[PDB]
Design a protein around this ligand. Sequence first.
Ligand SMILES: [Ca+2]
Ligand SMILES: [Ca+2]
Ligand SMILES: [Cl-]
Ligand SMILES: [Cl-]
Ligand SMILES: [Cl-]
Ligand SMILES: [Cl-]
Lengths: 346, 334, 346, 334
Amino acid sequence: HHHQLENLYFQGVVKVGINGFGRIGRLAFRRIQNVEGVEVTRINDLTDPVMLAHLLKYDTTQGRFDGTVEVKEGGFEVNGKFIKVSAERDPEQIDWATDGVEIVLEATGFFAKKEAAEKHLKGGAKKVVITAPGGNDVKTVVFNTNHDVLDGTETVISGASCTTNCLAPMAKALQDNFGVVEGLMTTIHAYTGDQMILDGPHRGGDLRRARAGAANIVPNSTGAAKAIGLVIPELNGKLDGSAQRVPTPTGSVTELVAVLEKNVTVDEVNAAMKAASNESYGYTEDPIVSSDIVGMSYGSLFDATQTKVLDVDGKQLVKVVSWYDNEMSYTAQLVRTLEYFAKIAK
Amino acid sequence: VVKVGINGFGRIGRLAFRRIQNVEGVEVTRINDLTDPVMLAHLLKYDTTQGRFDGTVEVKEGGFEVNGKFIKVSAERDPEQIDWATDGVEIVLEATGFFAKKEAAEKHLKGGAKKVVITAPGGNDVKTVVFNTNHDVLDGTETVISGASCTTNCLAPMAKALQDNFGVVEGLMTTIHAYTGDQMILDGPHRGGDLRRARAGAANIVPNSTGAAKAIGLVIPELNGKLDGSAQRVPTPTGSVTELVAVLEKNVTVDEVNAAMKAASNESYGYTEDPIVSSDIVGMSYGSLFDATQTKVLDVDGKQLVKVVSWYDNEMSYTAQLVRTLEYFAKIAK
Amino acid sequence: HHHQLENLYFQGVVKVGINGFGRIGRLAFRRIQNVEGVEVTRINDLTDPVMLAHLLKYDTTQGRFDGTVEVKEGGFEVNGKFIKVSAERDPEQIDWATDGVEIVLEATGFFAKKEAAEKHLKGGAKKVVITAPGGNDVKTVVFNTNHDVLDGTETVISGASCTTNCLAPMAKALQDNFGVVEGLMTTIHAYTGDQMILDGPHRGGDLRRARAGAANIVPNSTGAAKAIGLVIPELNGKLDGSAQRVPTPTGSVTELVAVLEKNVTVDEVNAAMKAASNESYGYTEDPIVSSDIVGMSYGSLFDATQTKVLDVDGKQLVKVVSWYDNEMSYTAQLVRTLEYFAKIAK
Amino acid sequence: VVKVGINGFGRIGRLAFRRIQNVEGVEVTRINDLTDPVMLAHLLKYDTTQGRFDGTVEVKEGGFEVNGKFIKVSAERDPEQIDWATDGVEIVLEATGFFAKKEAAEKHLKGGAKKVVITAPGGNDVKTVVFNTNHDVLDGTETVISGASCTTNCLAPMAKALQDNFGVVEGLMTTIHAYTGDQMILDGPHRGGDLRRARAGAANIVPNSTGAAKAIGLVIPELNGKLDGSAQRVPTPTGSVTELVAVLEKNVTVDEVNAAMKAASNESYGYTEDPIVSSDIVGMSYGSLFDATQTKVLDVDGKQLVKVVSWYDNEMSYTAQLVRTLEYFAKIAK
Ligand SMILES: [Ca+2]
Ligand SMILES: [Ca+2]
Ligand SMILES: [Cl-]
Ligand SMILES: [Cl-]
Ligand SMILES: [Cl-]
Ligand SMILES: [Cl-]
């Protein structure tokens, strides 16, 4: 009876707008091409469209675009369909509604806070998903970990980080099955665009991101584990971590060393992960390596071959390890949350 | 003068030769390897990661002339075939990827050598020595000893310091490690059957099993059975870093942890507070370099997990430790 | 009237056998999965099948296998179909005919010469294609450059090398349109399995292949240009060349600097290449880079953006440049020749 | 003592500082760069490709203390803002990726410097000097000069030797070149609009335009307009090799070509017959290293095409040439 959900039953097309056509924005565009009932009808980015079209067609790590891309006067012709490309620097000036846009992926990195991201509503968009944390009045959502926190009335939400989308389902499964006292994370992580190609002054003052990223093992700080409480309240304040950036251009792996609230065996841990598996959190027993997860659609892929339970006179330390393509795994999660959020809008 | 012979002129054998050139009272007078000496001379002169050789190398009838001195190069395959005594060799560096067994390594004594140091674990009936961690275990009467592995030479002083200052309940190690010659350059069948070492080593993050932490008890009895670990091989050709996450027997602060490491520092175990990266340690002579910038103490309602991290050049750091043990071992004679 | 060709008209299935399941053998298997009317019914390789199945499923440069692979008693289950995998070290002992094999891809590198490769005929196979040169009584075939040299009665043929399959259509187009006096080739080439991962003794005695291949620019000798006469008789003895191996795991590019028999312009050269283009020899005017050709199906991809015509008081030197994936481009050519050879057998 | 000031403490500026430490009678007394001195001190100490600094570096109020001596570090952005004379600087190394113009570079003279050397082409009204190829063109009265590019410093002695011995009709260059800081670490918009420098530089073979061969006439008048070329950038962080394919004015043999290069050899132009690879030249002080193992003479019915190949460390080889020109330029004063 009619306080009912509707968009799940009778929505034809979810029209998406992308503000910021960097790595994530372009990869989200690519994924949406394969999502029935969701399509991008507007891109906004200050870069010359000739440059943007070229980078959409050709991608070092993710391969050639599946289809044709041609620059036109007001935007691109992508697999026939024209798609407007604007270059407004003020989000309040983007007339999203003229292109039917209802939800915006905000991926520039300059409008993270609620009031900043809500500028897209002035142009007529209804909802916004941020490609980063994750402020004071904004929920953080890892799809298939805590998207049930959404009621559909929120205006701005965060898709969390890529590392959070890998860690969260793995840490939650430990908590649900065994209980976590505390734990430390180490991500062995592909280099990224916040590192220098060769040694040189880094804008932020980071003496390690100043170093050649493709020729070094580079320690760097993280926030996923310290901030996990935003996705899994029961783990608030229980985890910390850091990263080692290494010379691959994409593909990463997350290790968690944890003290649990009860004793376990390796098989029990692995069986718990298998039972928690879904389209966001995969399970494998194959001895794969990082190139095997590039382009994959899981947000997180648990690797049962790397599980360890160290038992010393009954005192136990546990290691669990999950793979992720820090590019496409995070993008696949963003797109799941984009669609879900739009469809439970009401 | 300690006259040393080298069996196996691979990465470690060649780098040990380079180091011994600078150890007064130690000199190599006999190399032997089943490779054409022209190939060996070229690989001694030119080294992708460790640079060009300091001096002159010329191939001559029976071996090399290195900085004037001639050095016999043989090509046997049984240590008994090596007349170490004809070249005056007293102690042998055994550095082929095989032969890591006492009876197997004792074959060199028939050729007239007195002592043998094997460049890998092989310690069922053989003492395992990380210099400046436990070389005091040697009395000089041993025939064959092990220099342990390079991961052990990195971990051991760090783990020993935690044990000495605070007590260790248990711990898990992760080493982010340069690729090595037991991995394939491109995807292909690995002779051991390892499905991960069969993969392209310079284009992947590759999980790898280790033994350093599980076998630490051979170097630090007080840690026997308390540790486990594993590795992630990554696309650098040398330079590695070892992380240890441990449960200790008392609560600590970060400053207390770092101060304990500094107090344990010496020529084998370095200390830095500079935010370095892996290229900054390639070629260094410390066996282990503790990095105070990476220390973590997670305290959750008084229960603590501690992370400590040391760097090492898995090539030159290990080699420098081997040569320390070679010199000391020869010095304390029998 | 009935001295007619038949296999082009009424052949149902070309059954292929692969001797040697290395990089090329596995990639040829992958391509054949997408070739209607051609299928592999027998693999012979001395490697443990568990290792071989794993390497077919997971491929660092060419991605995950499109489908499922499962080890069975006598071989593999690949996308349902069972495929026998033997491990005979003597090719005369391979009973190809029991599996209906008519043509063998001989890719071990130990049976290049005619008499050696003809051992496969003892087991009942009819034809053999060698994945390397290219002996004294054996024709060398670059598909869509000189496959018309085949009359279908040959027993053993060579698919040439991967570098030859890139150079040949480019050199032939210059010869046909303008005439070649002489020329020198330089390939900038991915590292390969004949190089060491770290500095160490090389079995062949090559002091450069002994060096770490992923951490160096490594000069190495070639044979494609010196031996081009085997594919293009009119260029016999007119070319020489060499290679620089560089730190990418696949993807290569071939430059030819040539003296021609007449003066030209850059546009004239590029137009000549466009007219010579086909499914083996592509044409592009996009400023691509090496990652953009990994996995591609052209044997050779001419890049019009790199064309140069240096004219000094009327004396001209010309540079033309073509891309190739030294893995998949060569494999795609091998598979074209495999099918054609089987189908004009008669 | 020649007192030098450095504007721009990037790769070249820092490596030139490292070299000048070993040039007696030349010393840097003033650096200025718009970067925080803490960042600059860290990058001087630690260098991914060129190793750790030889000495001590400590940040202090007005700059660095390097091996005791204090060195002022400023952060202006207009050469007139630099009081070179207050620091006694006579000659300025102008090494920011901009300012490659005579009037632009002459701004340093207002601050009290006498001469300027720009670390890139900028030669419309500025002489271009490859040391030991054409530094005899300087008379000492010039204010601003160019050290040319690093590709020019590699090509020039090789091309000059062909011209001197045999005569050059024409030629095309290909350099297989390390990636540089004008390429992206990952695919992304390039500020110049270059669709190839927008691509991940350590994961691709990247075609690149050059100017060294087209502009060679500025260093070797006899080759003006005779050459063209281009580059392939590849995944090494330093170390490069330049190939020249040329039509000569007479027929030659390989031995004749190689002998001519050996006779042209000097401190700027080296000669080797060893089959080296790129890591063997990183850090070398020669501007150019001719490799006789790569020489080709293709003779087809008497018509010849010749290939000659030289190595260079696009970082340190170029820097060593710059510092040679700095010293000479200061020495021949006005
Ligand atoms: Ca869609
Ligand atoms: Ca098929
Ligand atoms: Cl964290
Ligand atoms: Cl272990
Ligand atoms: Cl050739
Ligand atoms: Cl040029």
